[PDB]
Amino acid sequence: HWGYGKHNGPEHWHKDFPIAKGERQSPVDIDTHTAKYDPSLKPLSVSYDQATSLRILNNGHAFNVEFDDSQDKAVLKGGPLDGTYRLIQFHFHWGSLDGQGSEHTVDKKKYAAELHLVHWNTKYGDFGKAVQQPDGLAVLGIFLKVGSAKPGLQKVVDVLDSIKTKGKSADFTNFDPRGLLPESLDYWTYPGSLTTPPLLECVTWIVLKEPISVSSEQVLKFRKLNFNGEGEPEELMVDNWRPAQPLKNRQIKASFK
Numbered sequence: 001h002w003g004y005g006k007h008n009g010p011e012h013w014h015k016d017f018p019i020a021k022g023e024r025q026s027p028v029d030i031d032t033h034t035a036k037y038d039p040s041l042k043p044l045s046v047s048y049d050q051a052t053s054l055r056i057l058n059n060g061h062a063f064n065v066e067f068d069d070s071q072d073k074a075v076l077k078g079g080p081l082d083g084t085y086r087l088i089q090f091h092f093h094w095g096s097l098d099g100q101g102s103e104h105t106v107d108k109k110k111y112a113a114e115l116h117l118v119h120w121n122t123k124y125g126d127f128g129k130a131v132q133q134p135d136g137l138a139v140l141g142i143f144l145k146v147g148s149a150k151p152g153l154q155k156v157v158d159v160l161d162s163i164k165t166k167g168k169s170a171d172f173t174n175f176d177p178r179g180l181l182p183e184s185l186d187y188w189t190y191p192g193s194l195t196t197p198p199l200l201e202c203v204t205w206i207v208l209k210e211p212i213s214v215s216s217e218q219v220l221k222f223r224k225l226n227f228n229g230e231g232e233p234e235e236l237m238v239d240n241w242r243p244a245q246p247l248k249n250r251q252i253k254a255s256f257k
């Protein structure tokens with residue numbers, strides 16, 4: 001299937017997912033100078049106090065920590081959103097080197113990695129339905145920069161040994177996603193899509209201005225994951241990020257000046 005190799009990378013995805021050349025694709029470059037500061041923008045409402053993590057699994061593209069989205073346990077409201085978006089999973093996109101990994105860039109600047117807390121609009125019933133609507137999903141993107149260790153991230157770093165290869169998973173309960181959030185909830189927002197196939201344009205992107213810092217050894221562990229499954233030639237999971245797409249007839253609105 002698709003991937004990030006020269007033969008099945010982002011530059012080949014259109015052949016199987018024509019929407020790859022659609023009108024509102026992500027990621028995009030966030031030009032801070034021409035992004036319109038919108039004052040009618042309400043503040044974000046992140047309520048992860050009842051968040052219930054279930055497991056973490058390597059899916060061949062990255063590891064995901066899934067959450068029990070059966071009830072309004074961890075939701076995102078406010079900001080550019082209308083309705084309540086329920087958290088279902090979060091993942092990261094990172095690179096082989098420190099100066100690459102984030103999918104979104106700020107003024108062309110790339111970050112070591114990018115965290116995406118994926119939510120789905122509950123007014124649609126289930127997830128599979130939300131992905132059939134232009135406002136079905138809300139992804140909170142957070143930039144990770146190398147520096148001091150992010151305490152709340154270490155719990156995830158420790159478990160990466162038991163899910164080295166594709167298909168593996170492990171119980172990962174009682175994880176508090178709030179330990180991965182920056183101090184400020186200031187953001188940028190625009191309408192976009194998933195950054196991986198099927199590349200659906202159902203996402204309202206909220207990219208926080210403030211990045212979190214993770215240590216070198218922390219992100220280093222990410223790079224030890226395997227794209228491949230057990231018993232197959234080792235293929236390091238690194239650079240599982242998509243390049244920026246044309247903004248086209250879209251504008252980025254900041255919730256700050």
Ligand SMILES: CN[C@H]1CN(c2cccc(OC)c2)S(=O)(=O)c2sc(S(N)(=O)=O)cc21
Nearest residue numbers: 061116118128131139193194195196197198
């Ligand atoms: C591969 N995982 C991706 C697709 N996913 C997915 C899973 C099940 C069904 C489905 O479409 C019917 C899509 S997903 O919506 O959860 C996400 S969010 C996301 S990102 N990087 O833009 O935040 C990439 C993916």
Ligand SMILES: [Hg+2]
Nearest residue numbers: 131133201202
């Ligand atoms: Hg959609």
Ligand SMILES: [Zn+2]
Nearest residue numbers: 091093116195
């Ligand atoms: Zn992602």
